[PDB]
């Protein structure tokens, strides 16, 4: 499918993957997340989840994408690059056993 990614950035030095995926799930949607450090690629079902998912990250204050792990607010970044994401793609296509 396409369209359906979002980055997290500025994850604090060292934190889990689990931490990263437990904090995407309280936005209630089925995700598949891949952890670098300090990026996690967050993966959504299809483009509605994936709106759906920014939606309810969406402070209505700021207008600000946040996402709160370990405490601190991490930005999301939604506009993937177009290039970037065939990395994604690709890396994933290779990377799974």
Wanted: with cysteine; net charge positive; charged share 25%.
């Amino acid at each position: 499918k396409q369209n359906c990614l979002i980055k997290i950035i500025n994850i604090p030095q060292g934190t889990l993957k689990a931490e990263v995926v437990l904090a995407v799930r309280h936005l209630g949607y089925e995700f598949y997340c891949d952890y670098i450090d300090g990026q996690a690629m967050i993966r959504f079902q299809n483009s509605d989840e994936q709106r759906l998912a920014i939606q309810k990250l969406l402070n209505h204050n700021n207008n600000k994408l946040q996402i709160e792990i370990r405490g601190q607010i991490c930005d999301v970044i939604s506009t993937i690059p177009e290039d970037e994401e065939k990395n994604y793609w690709n890396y994933i296509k290779f990377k799974k056993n």
